[PDB]
Design a protein around this ligand. Structure first.
Ligand SMILES: CCCCn1nc(-c2ccc(O)cc2O)c2cccc(C(F)(F)F)c21
Ligand SMILES: CCCCn1nc(-c2ccc(O)cc2O)c2cccc(C(F)(F)F)c21
Lengths: 9, 221, 211, 9
């Protein structure tokens, strides 16, 4: 899940 | 929630994302490639801007994803229209990509931008609206209660700005309404956008990025 | 014109007495019911719209555009209004109440649900509802100015009389108007559902107008 | 168009 990851970062 | 109206303002403006360039070659599907490519690249900035919106961090990752999935195109579109002011009859997708009149979508964008112009929309007002769209687009689709209070707080800000602008109360009420009514049309433009963006996939002529497709698949169609 | 010459109380009157009646009902079964109900409510909507101050002041061509654009929104806000008192279910007609266990649409069924419960918590009043509905008619296809400003005054007028403070007045306004964005959303999604069922001439001409 | 008609009478 790209959007989830980049938000985690 | 602790922020003063001015703090919120200043906080939103310093969180503002940059205006990216297209790969438009003022030499030589084409433009559509430029649009989706540009959008994808802006998304990364929208994410880190969204986390700099007061209240957004307080939400669980899960809710934040849904909110961005719902609002991304509404956010891009209002950004575009803001830029596209003082550019009567043209849409400024990028400093290097200024266009004249899916043409319906273009015309609605044109009309919308024209409104902010005639309304004399201000930068502080702009960042409030954008923060609203992010928090309101998917709130309906104890964490929402928390969104409304922030939404109420952003509303107290807008008024504050209008009060400072010298507008009488009746004027703040009316101006506040006009702006919010305009968000409804921005919702409509988004919905239509998602539809065309969906055709382009099944068209496989347009080049969608993996992140753009994941966004599109969240919205279903 | 005329609308701009109306006081807040008159504006509320005009609207309250333009109110269409609540009609009674009669996958293939449920939708035949909604389309039949919807079709009959359309006739009442057309004549109600004309009783909305400022609407008559529009050319026939402009009047047709707003209705083609907003009708499903008009129907939906009415449905959600009827469904306030019935948490968990949607009241299309006094004899037609449906739960999400039948909508299998289901996602739209839910959105309409959440929208109705939102009106409940806000304790949305009838006068407020009639204002909101006239707003959807005038604003949705607008892309009216001074007519819309008037309803705003009317809404604030209503809240003030209700005893609300200056701050409370402007955030209830905000909250209320924000829901129109969601209703615009539900309408567009719904219009897609109506289109797949088509893969009455009036309802067909209404759908085509949108696509 | 039917809407054209209904809006007149
Ligand atoms: C006439 C324009 C068509 C609609 N549209 N607009 C953008 C867009 C891109 C970047 C930005 O800063 C703001 C924007 O509004 C866009 C992105 C991807 C796909 C679509 C489409 F498929 F709906 F056309 C877009
Ligand atoms: C699960 C959600 C169903 C969507 N829906 N709702 C109505 C409707 C009818 C009468 C009324 O007073 C208010 C309403 O919202 C409706 C009419 C025709 C078609 C559709 C559909 F295809 F989108 F489901 C409708």
């Amino acid at each position: 899940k790209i959007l989830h990851r980049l938000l985690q970062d | 929630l602790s922020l003063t109206a001015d703090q919120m303002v200043s906080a939103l403006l310093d969180a503002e994302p940059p205006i990216l360039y297209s790969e438009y070659d003022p030499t030589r599907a084409s433009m559509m490639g430029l649009l989706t490519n540009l959008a994808d690249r802006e998304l990364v900035h929208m994410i880190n801007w969204a986390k700099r919106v007061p209240g957004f961090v307080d939400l669980t990752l899960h809710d934040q994803v849904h909110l961005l999935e719902c609002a991304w195109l509404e956010i891009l579109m209002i950004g575009l229209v803001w830029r596209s002011m003082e550019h009567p009859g043209k849409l400024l997708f990028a400093p290097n990509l200024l266009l004249d009149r899916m043409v319906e979508i273009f015309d609605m964008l044109l009309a919308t931008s024209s409104r902010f112009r005639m309304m004399n929309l201000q930068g502080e007002e702009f960042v409030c609206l954008k923060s609203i769209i992010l928090l309101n687009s998917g709130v309906y689709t104890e964490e929402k209660d928390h969104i409304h209070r922030v939404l109420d707080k952003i509303t107290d800000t807008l008024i504050h700005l209008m009060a400072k602008a010298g507008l009488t109360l009746q004027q703040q009420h009316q101006r506040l309404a006009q702006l919010l009514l305009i968000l409804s049309h921005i919702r409509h433009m988004s919905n239509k956008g998602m539809e065309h963006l969906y055709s382009m996939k099944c068209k496989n002529v347009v080049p969608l990025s993996d992140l753009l497709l994941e966004m599109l698949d969240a919205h279903r169609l």
